[PDB]
Design an enzyme around this catalytic site. Structure first.
Site, PDB file in Angstrom:
ATOM      1  N   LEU A  20      45.870  48.802  46.145  1.00 51.30           N
ATOM      2  CA  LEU A  20      46.376  46.748  45.544  1.00 51.30           C
ATOM      3  C   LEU A  20      45.697  47.732  44.131  1.00 51.30           C
ATOM      4  O   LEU A  20      46.827  46.729  42.930  1.00 51.30           O
ATOM      5  CB  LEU A  20      45.514  46.578  46.300  1.00 51.30           C
ATOM      6  CG  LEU A  20      45.902  46.301  47.723  1.00 51.30           C
ATOM      7  CD1 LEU A  20      44.773  44.852  47.152  1.00 51.30           C
ATOM      8  CD2 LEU A  20      47.603  45.823  47.632  1.00 51.30           C
ATOM      9  N   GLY A  21      45.066  48.363  43.225  1.00 46.84           N
ATOM     10  CA  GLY A  21      44.394  48.611  41.746  1.00 46.84           C
ATOM     11  C   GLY A  21      43.555  49.052  42.246  1.00 46.84           C
ATOM     12  O   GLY A  21      42.604  49.178  42.670  1.00 46.84           O
ATOM     13  N   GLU A  22      43.140  49.537  40.900  1.00 48.78           N
ATOM     14  CA  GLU A  22      42.095  50.048  39.886  1.00 48.78           C
ATOM     15  C   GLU A  22      40.873  49.167  39.926  1.00 48.78           C
ATOM     16  O   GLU A  22      40.782  48.568  38.111  1.00 48.78           O
ATOM     17  CB  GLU A  22      41.929  51.320  39.080  1.00 48.78           C
ATOM     18  N   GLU A  95      38.543  38.232  51.011  1.00 45.73           N
ATOM     19  CA  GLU A  95      39.697  38.010  51.504  1.00 45.73           C
ATOM     20  C   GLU A  95      41.033  38.595  49.870  1.00 45.73           C
ATOM     21  O   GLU A  95      41.235  38.804  48.791  1.00 45.73           O
ATOM     22  CB  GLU A  95      40.164  36.067  50.811  1.00 45.73           C
ATOM     23  CG  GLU A  95      38.956  35.930  51.645  1.00 45.73           C
ATOM     24  CD  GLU A  95      38.934  34.123  51.065  1.00 45.73           C
ATOM     25  OE1 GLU A  95      38.854  33.526  50.067  1.00 45.73           O
ATOM     26  OE2 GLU A  95      39.111  33.117  51.940  1.00 45.73           O
ATOM     27  N   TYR A  96      41.944  38.697  51.053  1.00 44.65           N
ATOM     28  CA  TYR A  96      43.228  39.341  50.474  1.00 44.65           C
ATOM     29  C   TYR A  96      44.448  38.145  49.361  1.00 44.65           C
ATOM     30  O   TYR A  96      44.387  37.203  50.184  1.00 44.65           O
ATOM     31  CB  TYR A  96      44.379  39.840  51.060  1.00 44.65           C
ATOM     32  CG  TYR A  96      45.480  40.837  50.985  1.00 44.65           C
ATOM     33  CD1 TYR A  96      45.733  41.121  49.878  1.00 44.65           C
ATOM     34  CD2 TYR A  96      47.240  39.767  51.911  1.00 44.65           C
ATOM     35  CE1 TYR A  96      47.143  41.653  49.433  1.00 44.65           C
ATOM     36  CE2 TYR A  96      48.394  40.571  51.443  1.00 44.65           C
ATOM     37  CZ  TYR A  96      48.321  41.296  50.236  1.00 44.65           C
ATOM     38  OH  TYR A  96      49.546  42.229  49.709  1.00 44.65           O
ATOM     39  N   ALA A  97      44.470  38.347  48.399  1.00 44.94           N
ATOM     40  CA  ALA A  97      45.747  37.205  47.833  1.00 44.94           C
ATOM     41  C   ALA A  97      47.469  38.222  47.530  1.00 44.94           C
ATOM     42  O   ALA A  97      47.072  39.016  46.501  1.00 44.94           O
ATOM     43  CB  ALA A  97      45.522  37.242  46.264  1.00 44.94           C
ATOM     44  N   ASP A 152      34.770  35.856  31.679  1.00 42.10           N
ATOM     45  CA  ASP A 152      36.369  36.677  31.129  1.00 42.10           C
ATOM     46  C   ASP A 152      36.856  35.381  31.792  1.00 42.10           C
ATOM     47  O   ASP A 152      37.703  36.187  32.668  1.00 42.10           O
ATOM     48  CB  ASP A 152      36.136  38.062  31.789  1.00 42.10           C
ATOM     49  CG  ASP A 152      37.239  38.460  31.747  1.00 42.10           C
ATOM     50  OD1 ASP A 152      38.223  38.369  30.722  1.00 42.10           O
ATOM     51  OD2 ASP A 152      37.746  40.000  32.149  1.00 42.10           O
ATOM     52  N   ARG A 156      44.589  35.879  34.111  1.00 42.23           N
ATOM     53  CA  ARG A 156      44.780  37.908  35.240  1.00 42.23           C
ATOM     54  C   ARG A 156      43.459  37.525  36.343  1.00 42.23           C
ATOM     55  O   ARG A 156      43.611  38.311  37.556  1.00 42.23           O
ATOM     56  CB  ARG A 156      44.418  38.858  34.095  1.00 42.23           C
ATOM     57  CG  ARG A 156      43.275  39.132  33.604  1.00 42.23           C
ATOM     58  CD  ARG A 156      42.915  40.662  32.293  1.00 42.23           C
ATOM     59  NE  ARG A 156      41.684  40.082  31.872  1.00 42.23           N
ATOM     60  CZ  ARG A 156      41.766  39.133  30.429  1.00 42.23           C
ATOM     61  NH1 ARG A 156      42.718  38.934  29.921  1.00 42.23           N
ATOM     62  NH2 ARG A 156      41.121  38.931  29.486  1.00 42.23           N
ATOM     63  N   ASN A 157      42.362  36.593  35.938  1.00 43.65           N
ATOM     64  CA  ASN A 157      41.368  36.668  37.232  1.00 43.65           C
ATOM     65  C   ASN A 157      41.029  35.566  37.867  1.00 43.65           C
ATOM     66  O   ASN A 157      40.039  35.161  38.505  1.00 43.65           O
ATOM     67  CB  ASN A 157      39.915  37.097  35.821  1.00 43.65           C
ATOM     68  CG  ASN A 157      40.213  37.776  35.639  1.00 43.65           C
ATOM     69  OD1 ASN A 157      39.875  39.283  36.172  1.00 43.65           O
ATOM     70  ND2 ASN A 157      38.800  38.339  34.719  1.00 43.65           N
ATOM     71  N   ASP A 170      36.786  38.001  40.398  1.00 41.01           N
ATOM     72  CA  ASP A 170      35.248  38.781  38.998  1.00 41.01           C
ATOM     73  C   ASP A 170      34.561  37.953  38.608  1.00 41.01           C
ATOM     74  O   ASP A 170      34.344  37.974  38.014  1.00 41.01           O
ATOM     75  CB  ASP A 170      35.908  39.656  38.338  1.00 41.01           C
ATOM     76  CG  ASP A 170      36.432  41.270  39.056  1.00 41.01           C
ATOM     77  OD1 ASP A 170      36.452  40.724  39.886  1.00 41.01           O
ATOM     78  OD2 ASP A 170      37.728  41.925  38.938  1.00 41.01           O
TER      79      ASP A 170
HETATM   80  C1  LIG Z   1      33.986  42.828  46.079  1.00 42.05           C
HETATM   81  O1  LIG Z   1      35.041  42.805  45.950  1.00 42.05           O
HETATM   82  C2  LIG Z   1      36.167  42.192  45.043  1.00 42.05           C
HETATM   83  C3  LIG Z   1      35.328  41.053  44.211  1.00 42.05           C
HETATM   84  C4  LIG Z   1      36.248  40.549  43.418  1.00 42.05           C
HETATM   85  O2  LIG Z   1      36.046  39.057  43.271  1.00 42.05           O
HETATM   86  C5  LIG Z   1      34.852  38.944  42.811  1.00 42.05           C
HETATM   87  C6  LIG Z   1      37.787  40.910  43.799  1.00 42.05           C
HETATM   88 CL1  LIG Z   1      38.720  39.807  42.766  1.00 42.05          CL
HETATM   89  C7  LIG Z   1      38.535  41.003  44.304  1.00 42.05           C
HETATM   90  N1  LIG Z   1      39.649  41.927  44.437  1.00 42.05           N
HETATM   91  C8  LIG Z   1      40.339  41.769  45.501  1.00 42.05           C
HETATM   92  C9  LIG Z   1      41.306  41.398  45.680  1.00 42.05           C
HETATM   93  C10 LIG Z   1      42.271  40.492  46.577  1.00 42.05           C
HETATM   94  N2  LIG Z   1      43.972  40.444  46.821  1.00 42.05           N
HETATM   95  C11 LIG Z   1      44.345  41.342  45.811  1.00 42.05           C
HETATM   96  N3  LIG Z   1      46.048  41.161  45.541  1.00 42.05           N
HETATM   97  C12 LIG Z   1      46.594  41.744  44.518  1.00 42.05           C
HETATM   98  C13 LIG Z   1      47.259  41.385  43.532  1.00 42.05           C
HETATM   99  C14 LIG Z   1      47.612  42.568  42.719  1.00 42.05           C
HETATM  100  C15 LIG Z   1      49.454  42.313  43.078  1.00 42.05           C
HETATM  101  C16 LIG Z   1      49.039  42.774  44.810  1.00 42.05           C
HETATM  102  C17 LIG Z   1      48.425  42.530  45.431  1.00 42.05           C
HETATM  103  N4  LIG Z   1      44.062  41.858  45.091  1.00 42.05           N
HETATM  104  C18 LIG Z   1      42.772  42.264  44.701  1.00 42.05           C
HETATM  105  N5  LIG Z   1      41.930  42.408  43.763  1.00 42.05           N
HETATM  106  C19 LIG Z   1      42.436  43.135  43.095  1.00 42.05           C
HETATM  107  C20 LIG Z   1      43.105  44.212  42.690  1.00 42.05           C
HETATM  108  C21 LIG Z   1      43.920  44.750  41.731  1.00 42.05           C
HETATM  109  N6  LIG Z   1      44.047  43.254  40.872  1.00 42.05           N
HETATM  110  C22 LIG Z   1      45.026  43.001  40.180  1.00 42.05           C
HETATM  111  O3  LIG Z   1      45.227  41.946  39.901  1.00 42.05           O
HETATM  112  C23 LIG Z   1      46.205  43.713  39.725  1.00 42.05           C
HETATM  113  C24 LIG Z   1      46.902  44.155  38.368  1.00 42.05           C
HETATM  114  C25 LIG Z   1      47.621  44.886  38.568  1.00 42.05           C
HETATM  115  N7  LIG Z   1      49.612  45.060  38.452  1.00 42.05           N
HETATM  116  C26 LIG Z   1      50.195  45.305  36.777  1.00 42.05           C
HETATM  117  C27 LIG Z   1      49.943  44.827  39.436  1.00 42.05           C
HETATM  118  C28 LIG Z   1      42.863  42.130  42.108  1.00 42.05           C
HETATM  119  C29 LIG Z   1      40.518  42.177  43.680  1.00 42.05           C
HETATM  120  O4  LIG Z   1      39.660  42.852  43.119  1.00 42.05           O
HETATM  121  C30 LIG Z   1      37.597  42.285  44.949  1.00 42.05           C
HETATM  122 CL2  LIG Z   1      37.964  43.832  46.155  1.00 42.05          CL
END
Ligand SMILES: COc1cc(OC)c(Cl)c(N2Cc3cnc(NC4CCCCC4)nc3N([C@H]3CCN(C(=O)/C=C/CN(C)C)C3)C2=O)c1Cl
Length: 276
Positions: A20-22, A95-97, A152, A156-157, A170
């Protein structure tokens, strides 16, 4: 690492999916996450340490997880769902978004200001935009009530679920989102988060606009002390602009609280039609 039966999920109940990303985040499927429905699969996001990860990376990941346990549930934050801590590397399940962060979500819904996506999406109503702001304020109001200071806050968050629910990201751990007092003295408070929210409001009504476009970082704090404030977006009511400006009060004590913002946004949402 010590086990915690309140959150542990057996490792074999989690089917790892795509990046999903880094550390790094992968999509996954959780089998029988709800013990009452043991044959149900639920899509989840999973965080784990990166390939070349340090000791600091590990204990931050743990701190984040332990912090998430304490904060408790709210529908407008990214909630903790479980963890795999025993039979191998640490997995934190949240949870997944599916629809991305709010900045991308909004940009991808610009009228074909420029739309960078080759896959554009349907227009958002005025009511949708206010309701997005309301949900984000609900998130922060809850976090603030649990004495959590974000530091922050930005579009984006914020993350958007398949059902268009806005969820704060985050919240348990850029200069253009910082209150002046944070920017100069490294003093972060609930009040500085309110400042950040004002910038976030401006993002909402520019459909993902970049703040202070063309202003170099170096200059910005000075401009801010001098009373520089972003102009009203072309398509935004005077009322909502005033809220931005209130969030950006130089005196932290004079900014509205998230409690009050939620109340104000609740009234505006009810007063904005689905068709305007
Ligand atoms: C302890 O684990 C977490 C604690 C968190 O906040 C307290 C969060 Cl926000 C996360 N998440 C959960 C999460 C859920 N769903 C998604 N969906 C993706 C959204 C981005 C597009 C595809 C699906 N992402 C989560 N992530 C990050 C993973 C990458 N994220 C982005 O916003 C990436 C943006 C880059 N663009 C160019 C695609 C959010 C997280 O880092 C996670 Cl894994």
């Amino acid at each position: 690492l010590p086990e915690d039966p309140r959150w542990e999920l057996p490792r074999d109940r989690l089917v790892l999916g795509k990046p999903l990303g880094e550390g790094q985040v992968v999509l996954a499927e959780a089998i029988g996450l709800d013990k009452d429905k043991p044959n149900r699969v639920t899509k989840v996001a999973v965080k784990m340490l990166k390939s070349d990860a340090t000791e600091k990376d590990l204990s931050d990941l743990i701190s984040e997880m332990e912090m998430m346990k304490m904060i408790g549930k709210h529908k407008n934050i990214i909630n903790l769902l479980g963890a795999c801590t025993q039979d191998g590397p640490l997995y934190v399940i949240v949870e997944y978004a599916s629809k991305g962060n709010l900045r991308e979500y909004l940009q991808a819904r610009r009228p074909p200001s420029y739309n960078p996506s080759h896959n554009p999406e349907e227009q958002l109503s005025s009511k949708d935009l206010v309701s997005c702001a309301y949900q984000v304020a609900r998130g922060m109001e809850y976090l603030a009530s649990k004495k959590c200071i974000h530091r922050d806050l930005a579009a984006r968050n914020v993350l958007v679920t398949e059902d268009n629910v806005m969820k704060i990201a985050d919240f348990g751990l850029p200069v253009k989102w910082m209150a002046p007092e944070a920017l100069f003295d490294r003093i972060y408070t609930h009040q500085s988060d309110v400042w950040s929210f004002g910038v976030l409001l401006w993002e909402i009504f520019t459909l993902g606009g970049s703040p202070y476009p063309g202003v170099p970082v170096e200059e910005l704090f000075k401009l801010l002390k001098e009373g520089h404030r972003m102009d009203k977006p072309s398509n935004c009511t005077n009322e909502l602009y005033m809220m931005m400006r209130d969030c950006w009060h130089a005196v932290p004590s004079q900014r509205p609280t998230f409690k009050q913002l939620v109340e104000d946004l609740d009234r505006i949402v009810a007063l904005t039609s689905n068709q305007e």
